[PDB]
Design a protein. Structure first.
Length: 68
DNA sequence: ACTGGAGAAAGAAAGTGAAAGGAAGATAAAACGGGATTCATACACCGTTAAATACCGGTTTAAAAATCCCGTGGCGCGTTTTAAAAAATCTGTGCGGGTGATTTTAT
């Protein structure tokens, strides 16, 4: 789901987080593809304050964010 | 000749799809054990009598009970271990409005 940029210098790159695919589609068409990236999420995210470490690890959105 | 960037080769480390097999499950056929009938047949209850046994009086005697000395092991005390049961603390889950997403078929 990641739409990456073309710059290879991390000090000149940006990342945007959006709520879902409907917002991501609109964001990808108006961005500057040279040094901007878009990563869509899915709904409300897990509350890590009330959860456990294994429960956090078993999540999918958190894993995708960590990988990104 | 020399320098530094860039592309291509070559080599080594990590991820991968496929692998007997075995303990761990699961599912049927079989052997079992516990009720409803059906009587014939052996068992329960009632008069009669010869016989076997219980009981009394007095011995006795051999065996068991009572008594004394002693020397030990089997209970008793104090202090540790160790499972077992109980109290305390975590883990899921569903109720109803909200946010955002997935898949298979025909022509």
């Amino acid at each position: 789901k990641l739409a990456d940029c073309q710059e290879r210098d991390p000090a000149l790159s940006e990342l945007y987080l959006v709520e879902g695919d409907s917002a991501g589609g609109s964001a990808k068409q108006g961005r500057n593809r040279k040094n901007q990236a878009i990563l869509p999420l899915k709904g409300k995210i897990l509350n890590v304050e009330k959860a456990r470490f294994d429960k956090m690890l078993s999540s999918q959105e958190v894993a995708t964010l960590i990988t990104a």
